[PDB]
DNA sequence: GAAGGGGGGCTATAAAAGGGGGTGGGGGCGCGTTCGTCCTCACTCTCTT
DNA sequence: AAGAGAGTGAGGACGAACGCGCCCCCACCCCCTTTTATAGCCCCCCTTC
């Protein structure tokens, strides 16, 4: 605002904090600018159950060693979905379960609602419920989850090398590109692609152990393994060394 | 159970038989019978006709029978009307809408057809108090006068001060 | 091994299938509620509306409602304001 | 006794009915501490004697 | 010129007030049930070896 210069664009200047006209040199305003704050160079009930519901999601997240950001990224959800009430009548211990599930799907990190519930006193069921409310109230989506979501978590907590993770995501991707697997949930398709994988190196993992990590019943992967035992050599990867051969692996 | 499990069920008995319509009075052992209280203890039989049946303010005791209490109990518009202005003559005070409700049955249309002779007060727990309409002297003013009279805070004064306006303007 | 993924936790889905078999208290004819209300009240001069429940073994509302046309709550100062059974 | 298979159950999806039960938000009053009022007492003057 | 009573300073026990809860009651919602097709998942029970 020179009084020369009608509408002149004043350069912020950090020397003393004022802003000086662009092309006279005139300071429009002694030190106003305020360069070192701007340059980096008695409990409400709403307030307390935010602050209850906040502590049970901190307490949910350690169970499962989640990192902090997606602790923020559920705890925005949560006050986003609890000023919209919608779910004011669902217990806030679901909302905050259904809102970490919806954080680590946002994330790229999806937990099976499985894994979600056992850190949570919400049963699966209410956890989906809560789930979908969520997303209408918040009129968001979550992109649809894939077997190679949970290789790494599967497969690390199975102790398995990372060829074996690198031959069963390999497997459950292309079983899904075969459509070998039509409708089957990405989840019971991943479990039995550890075992296919798992089963054709050293370190072989029974089907009991594959299911109580990934949450799938050893019925579930039996069904699924069956249906992509047939094309086998097809799935594995090229450049895959077999401990035991294709041709020899479990048939059941 | 034993003197106090089967007085009752001879207080609710009668309470039904009279909606019915039934004012006949009924004896000590008629009422024993339909209460399946035929073996009640014999000195409860005494008892219930010498304390309970004359003592309850619902027992009218008729030719040496007993008979429910209809006439206490308002089940006429006059008698609504007749109720209420004695609690006035005699100040006795209200009377709850529940307690009219359950005495008269469909009370509205009594109640209603009254009009204003009837004040209802309503308590904090949404219960209405009736009182006596007294005609005798009435006055009212508009809105405006009434908030105004707030308007003029008069506890806000001491009684010296109060006073002195009085002389101030010479009255 | 902890944590591990479960569709519902084994408390929950026994308390669940407890009051499944259980069920919800009925609705019980006035004159039965009336006549073991009035029986239980030789035992004990007052009782708790919650511990009433329990052995009336009725709705709540509805048990509130049958207490409320006889029954009468009184203040005491030692607990609470509790319920009595003596409608006088 | 280990393991596989058969039968059966759970879940979502809409929609309506009527009512019991759980839960959150306010309201109610009993009981463990705290300070000022009340009450007791040692060392000097005063009215009555 | 000398006794009880008292002023003053001063210490010790007690009641009303202040919190500070723990329990309770009243909205509000959800759940129960029934029907149906669908497909996957999962659990209980039976059977084979
Ligand atoms: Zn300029």
Redesign the interface.
């Known amino acids: 605002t020179c009084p020369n210069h009608p509408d002149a664009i004043l350069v912020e200047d950090y020397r003393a904090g004022d802003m000086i006209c662009p092309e006279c040199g005139l300071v429009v305003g002694d030190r106003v600018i305020d360069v070192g704050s701007e340059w980096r160079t008695t409990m409400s009930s709403s307030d307390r159950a935010m602050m209850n519901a906040f502590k049970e999601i901190t307490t949910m997240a350690d169970?499962?060693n989640l990192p902090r950001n997606i602790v923020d990224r559920t705890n925005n959800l949560f006050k986003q979905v609890y000023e919209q009430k919608s779910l004011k009548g669902r217990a806030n211990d679901a909302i905050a379960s259904a809102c970490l599930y919806i954080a680590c799907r946002q994330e790229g990190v999806p937990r099976?609602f499985?894994?979600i519930?056992?850190?949570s006193?919400i049963?699966?069921?209410e956890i989906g419920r809560c789930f979908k409310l969520i997303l209408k109230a918040l009129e968001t989506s979550v992109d649809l989850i894939t077997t190679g979501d949970f290789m790494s978590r599967f497969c690390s907590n199975l102790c398995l090398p990372k060829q074996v993770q690198m031959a069963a995501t390999h497997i459950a991707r292309k079983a899904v590109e075969l459509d070998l697997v039509p409708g089957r949930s990405p989840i019971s398709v991943a479990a039995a692609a550890i075992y296919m994988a798992s089963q054709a190196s050293a370190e072989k993992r029974t089907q009991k152990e594959i299911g109580?990590?990934?949450?799938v019943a050893d019925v579930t992967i039996r069904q699924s393994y069956r249906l992509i035992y047939p094309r086998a050599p097809d799935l594995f990867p090229t450049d895959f060394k077999f401990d035991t051969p294709v041709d020899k692996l479990p048939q059941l | 159970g034993y003197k106090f499990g089967v007085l009752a069920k001879i207080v609710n008995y009668m309470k039904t038989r009279h909606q019915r319509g039934d004012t006949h009075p009924l004896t000590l052992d008629e009422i024993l019978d339909e209460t399946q209280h035929l073996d009640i203890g014999l000195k409860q039989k005494q008892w219930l006709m010498t304390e309970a049946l004359v003592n309850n303010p619902k027992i009218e005791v008729i030719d040496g029978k007993y008979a429910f209490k209809p006439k206490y109990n308002v089940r006429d518009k006059k008698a609504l009307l007749r109720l209420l202005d004695q609690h006035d003559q005699r100040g006795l005070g209200g009377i709850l809408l529940e307690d009219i409700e359950e005495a008269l049955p469909n009370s509205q249309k009594a109640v209603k057809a009254l009009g204003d002779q009837i004040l209802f007060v309503n308590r904090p727990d949404k219960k209405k108090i009736l009182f006596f309409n007294d005609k005798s002297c009435q006055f009212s003013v508009d809105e405006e006068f009434q908030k105004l009279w707030r308007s003029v805070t008069v506890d806000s004064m001491d009684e010296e001060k109060i006073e002195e306006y009085l002389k101030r303007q010479g009255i | 091994?902890?944590?591990?993924?479960?569709?519902?936790?084994q408390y929950?889905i026994e308390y669940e299938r407890k009051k499944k078999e259980d069920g919800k208290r009925a609705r019980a004819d006035k004159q039965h509620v009336l006549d073991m209300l009035f029986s239980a009240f030789e035992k004990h001069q007052y009782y708790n509306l919650k511990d009433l429940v329990d052995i009336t073994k009725q709705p709540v509302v509805y048990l509130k409602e049958i207490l409320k046309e006889i029954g009468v709550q009184n203040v005491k100062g030692i607990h609470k304001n509790t319920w009595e059974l003596k409608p006088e």
Request: glycine share 4%.
């Open positions: 169970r499962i099976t499985k894994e519930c056992a850190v006193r049963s699966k069921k109580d990590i990934a949450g | 091994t902890n944590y591990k993924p479960v569709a519902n936790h929950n």
